[PDB]
Amino acid sequence: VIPSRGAWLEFDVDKRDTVGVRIDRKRRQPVTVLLKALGWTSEQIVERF
DNA sequence: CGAACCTGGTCTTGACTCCATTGCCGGATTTGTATTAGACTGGCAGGGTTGCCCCGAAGCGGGCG
């Protein structure tokens, strides 16, 4: 997700079957942690996915 | 055959002129330092976006003692 003058972010499936948020070129950081950082429950994730 | 002549360099005397060269000397300018008393109390900030290669370092899984 490329913005103009913002901050990059990526959701890359690794060598294993794990999706990972890389915000502003940080480390692997799986995406359910990012949804919980949006306050999304694990139940809300389960309902969504 | 001998005597003067005028004039080249070669040099000397002494007076005249003119300008460097300090030395003050007084003033102008300029370089550095100090001092401001109400209260103020943690920064903005884009280059990064390659490809490939070698290698050093962390980190964890794996067997292990």
Side-chain angles (χ1 to χ4, degrees), chain A residues 1-25 27 29-49:
Chain A
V1 191
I2 36 173
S4 45
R5 65 128 191 164
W8 284 19
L9 70 154
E10 288 92 347
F11 311 124
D12 313 339
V13 189
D14 70 316
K15 205 167 305 179
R16 271 86 43 201
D17 320 334
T18 77
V19 282
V21 171
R22 174 178 273 100
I23 42 98
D24 208 8
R25 310 142 189 279
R27 309 203 86 164
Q29 193 44 262
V31 322
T32 41
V33 182
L34 189 96
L35 265 298
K36 282 169 180 181
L38 260 79
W40 259 39
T41 87
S42 305
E43 187 267 346
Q44 283 188 5
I45 288 172
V46 152
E47 194 267 344
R48 185 81 201 187
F49 314 98

